[PDB]
Design a protein around this ligand. Sequence first.
Ligand SMILES: Cn1cc(O)c(=O)cc1C(=O)O
Ligand SMILES: [Mn+2]
Ligand SMILES: [Zn+2]
Length: 478
Amino acid sequence: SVSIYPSSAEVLKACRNLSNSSILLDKCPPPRPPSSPYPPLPKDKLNPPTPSIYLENKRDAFFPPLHQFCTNPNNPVTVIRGLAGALKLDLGLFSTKTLVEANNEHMVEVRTQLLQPADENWDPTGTKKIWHCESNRSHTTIAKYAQYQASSFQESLREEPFKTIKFGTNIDLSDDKKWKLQLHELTKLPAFVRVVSAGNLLSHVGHTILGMNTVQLYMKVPGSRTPGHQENNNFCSVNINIGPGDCEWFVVPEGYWGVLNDFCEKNNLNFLMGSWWPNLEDLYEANVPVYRFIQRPGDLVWINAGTVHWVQAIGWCNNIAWNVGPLTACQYKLAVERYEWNKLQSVKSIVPMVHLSWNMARNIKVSDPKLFEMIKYCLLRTLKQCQTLREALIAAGKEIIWHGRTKEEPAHYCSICEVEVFDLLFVTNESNSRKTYIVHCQDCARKTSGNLENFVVLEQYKMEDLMQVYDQFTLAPP
Ligand SMILES: Cn1cc(O)c(=O)cc1C(=O)O
Ligand SMILES: [Mn+2]
Ligand SMILES: [Zn+2]
């Protein structure tokens, strides 16, 4: 019941300033990748069994402890067995035959890959095992990928230096007028895995983040790989295998992501943006535990926050996937941590955590003190940053044009460095007049116009609005 944060009036008065007391240490320790976790694990604990939920009845899927089992930080992944059958989900709505009938001209992002043996990844000459995973981009239609997927299967039915294969990825199932029956089928899921829910942080973004708060579909042939990654901004993820074939999952706990980052660097690969497939022998030598399991048709895979993982098709199948963000301190903490790390790495945060945090403060009554403090700390830092910049512009006599923002207007990012740009947008005079609105962050704008002569400053939010949202965000009763 104790407020530990200053009021918006106090933050503003603090910004109106050499001799006065501080309100907070604006300096913050910079993000870095963690060392190998303590305590270290012996060899006999490096192949742990996968946390599993065995569903039989529709009632089983709505059992409240399921959500807590999945979000438990000690469980890096949970496989929910029999989920589609328990809910009488019609997986046929996502079959390739149904997709071709529904939208045969829909776009498919093809990844062209080498068919690699089992859990291994070899150089293209088949000489040695390497971490780099060849996966080159092209685009086709559902109709044409479907023909390939079907012909691949017929060819193998004939009983039979790596084969080239094609993985159909990132098929956009967001348009409810093209995918009405498919999307309605997913409303049968329990709330904690649904694409849209009041308890899903990504449902509070206020705009589409494609493939995170909308569904994407994947069409596969054996060997189709999603290489090593953490989810965007460490958000939990949901994956259902449509079948008819199986998928194989490889999972490492979040706490080892620094070790994996180091493995990538040692192999001349970028952890966040590169294409890499771990060598299991390297991980075993370094005492990194690996969860490894098969996802059958109708099985749902829950990837917990920040879990490091990589996946391959064993047979022919489709999968559907999206992300969710539990309303938890752990989820928010890891999303903010990766947001900060992404800035230092100049990697775009697909989830605009500042925009989202302010929407969370508008919409959500937070009753957990630890989560509440994290969100309000973020509001404090960004409110102070905005008012500081605003005063600096006013002090230099730089006009601030009221721009406002429309319904569901997305967060904007810097066209140069790809940082989120919140509230105060820097746009060149030319881009403003032509309404291209190429946003720059402050730092990137100044690098080409130290006094901002070539730029206008557009203001999205009234400062009074932000101050009121901040003051009205208080700890909710349990
Ligand atoms: C579609 N997808 C998305 C992810 O984030 C994965 O980790 C794995 C897949 C897959 O089914 O290969
Ligand atoms: Mn994933
Ligand atoms: Zn920038």
